[PDB]
Design a binder for this molecule. Structure first.
Ligand SMILES: Nc1ncnc2c1ncn2[C@@H]1O[C@H](COP(=O)(O)OP(=O)(O)O)[C@@H](O)[C@H]1O
Ligand SMILES: [Mg+2]
Length: 275
DNA sequence: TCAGGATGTATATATCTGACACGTGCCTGGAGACTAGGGAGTAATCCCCTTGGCGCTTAAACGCACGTACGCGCTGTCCCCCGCGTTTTAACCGCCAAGGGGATTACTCCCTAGTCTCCAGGCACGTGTCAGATATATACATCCGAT
C-alpha cells in the first residue's frame, strides 16, 4: 500500500526478457570459477586460518586447484542493512532476532558463501527467508529465479505466507497429475513467468529436466535433515542443478552422527568440503 | 459400399547411461627337463553273427458283406463372457535405524584321507539237483443279446 516506492527500478514483467537469464543458453557453460573460489577462500582464511587443512589436501589432489592455492598465497564497506525496524518492502512487523537472522543472511550473501539456518521450530524461519528474498528483489534487483523445495504438507503454507507479507512477488507451486503439471511447466516455467518456484521432494525427482534448464540463483530448501544423506536420490539429483549458491532452512541438524553434518555442509560449499 | 474413427507406425529430437577403450598387478599358461604307466600292437581261443538258402505247422491277416451307432451338420436358445466406463487402492519408489549374514584374505594346525605292505575271507563261477509254473482238458459259473 505504501512500500511500492521500492518497486521502482525493477524491469517490467515480460517472459521474453526473463528468458535471457532464466534459461541458461550455454549448453555446457558450467565451469570452475577461479575468482569465486579465491574470494571464498580469502574470506574464509580471513575469519580464521584453520581452514587450510582441507585446502592443502585438495591441493595434494588436482593441482589446478593447487595453483589457485598458490595464487591466494602470493598476492598476500559491505555495510549490513541492519533494519532497526521491520523491512519496508514487507508489510508487517519483525522481531529483533528475526532481524539478526536477516542480517546474517545478507552478510553471508555479500561474501560469496552461504549459511545453514537451523533455528528452533516456531521462530518464523519462512519469514526469515521471504524477507531475505524480498531484500534481493527490491534492493539487490534480482527478481528471480528461486527454487523453494519443501515438504508437500507445508507447500500451501509457504505460498500463503509469501503471498501475504510480500504480495508483489509472483510464485506458484507445481502439483497435480502429470498433464496439468506439464501444462503449468510449458505455460510458466519454461515460459519464464515467475520469480519463485515451489516444489516437493517428490516433484524435484519427477520434474528435474525442466528444472535443469534454468540458471538458479539459489535453491532454497525447507527442513533439511531430509538431505542429511548424500547418497539419497534427492541429494544426487540436487547436484546437477546449476546454481550460484544454496540455503538449508532446517530445525536441528546432526541428529544421529557427524558424517551427517559433513554431507550437510558439503551441500552448501562443495569446493571446501570436497573430501 | 462408402465415408467415419481409433490405433499402431513411422518421423524427428533432447537425454541418460553403460558399452567400449586404456593402464596396472598378478597370477597362471608356457618352456624346459624327467619319468612312469597307459595304451597300442600281437597273437591264441572260443562263441556269436552273417548270407545264401531249404522244408513244415499253424494261427493271424486279409478280404467281403451286412448293418448299426455315431460323427457331423443345422437349428435353436440361452447365458456367460467380453468391451467399456468409473472409482480406488496397492505397487513402487524413496527413506530410516541397527545388526547379522556371507564373501573374501590371510595364518594355524590337527587329523584324516591316501599310499604302501601283507594276508586271509569274500564272492563269483561251475556243477548238480528238485519244485513252481505252465498247458491241456474239464466241468462250473457267469454276463449278454433276442424273443
Ligand atoms: N507477525 C509474525 N511475526 C513472526 N512470525 C509469525 C508472525 N505471524 C505468524 N508467524 C509464524 O511464523 C511461522 C513460520 O512458519 P514455521 O512455523 O516456522 O513453519 P516451519 O517450521 O515449517 O518453517 C508460522 O508458523 C507463523 O505461526
Ligand atoms: Mg519449515
Amino acid at each position: 500500500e505504501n512500500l511500492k516506492p521500492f518497486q521502482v527500478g525493477l524491469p517490467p514483467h515480460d517472459p521474453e526478457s526473463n528468458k535471457k537469464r532464466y534459461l541458461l543458453k550455454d549448453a555446457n557453460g558450467k565451469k570452475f570459477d577461479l575468482e569465486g573460489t579465491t574470494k571464498r577462500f580469502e574470506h574464509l582464511l580471513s575469519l580464521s586460518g584453520l581452514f587450510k587443512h582441507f585446502i592443502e589436501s585438495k591441493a595434494a589432489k588436482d593441482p589446478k586447484f593447487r595453483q589457485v592455492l598458490d595464487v591466494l598465497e602470493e598476492n598476500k564497506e559491505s555495510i549490513e542493512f541492519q533494519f532497526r525496524e521491520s523491512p519496508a518492502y514487507v508489510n508487517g512487523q519483525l522481531r529483533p532476532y528475526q532481524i539478526q537472522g536477516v542480517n546474517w543472511l545478507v552478510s553471508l550473501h555479500k561474501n560469496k558463501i552461504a549459511g545453514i539456518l537451523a533455528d528452533e521450530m516456531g521462530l518464523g524461519k519462512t519469514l526469515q527467508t521471504i524477507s531475505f528474498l524480498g531484500y534481493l528483489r527490491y534492493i539487490e534487483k534480482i527478481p528471480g529465479p528461486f527454487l523453494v523445495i519443501a515438504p508437500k504438507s507445508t507447500l500451501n503454507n509457504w505460498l500463503r505466507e509469501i503471498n501475504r507479507w510480500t504480495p508483489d512477488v509472483n510464485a506458484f507451486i507445481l502439483q497435480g497429475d502429470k498433464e496439468e503439471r506439464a501444462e503449468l511447466i510449458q505455460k510458466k516455467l519454461l515460459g519464464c513467468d515467475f520469480d519463485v518456484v515451489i516444489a516437493s521432494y517428490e516433484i524435484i525427482i519427477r520434474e528435474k529436466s525442466p528444472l535443469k534448464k534454468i540458471n538458479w540463483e539459489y535453491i532454497i530448501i525447507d527442513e533439511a535433515h531430509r538431505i542429511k544423506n548424500e547418497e539419497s536420490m534427492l541429494s544426487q539429483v540436487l547436484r546437477e542443478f546449476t546454481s550460484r549458491n544454496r540455503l538449508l532452512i532446517t530445525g536441528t541438524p546432526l541428529q544421529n552422527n557427524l558424517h551427517e553434518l559433513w554431507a550437510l555442509l558439503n551441500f552448501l560449499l562443495p569446493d571446501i568440503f570436497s573430501d
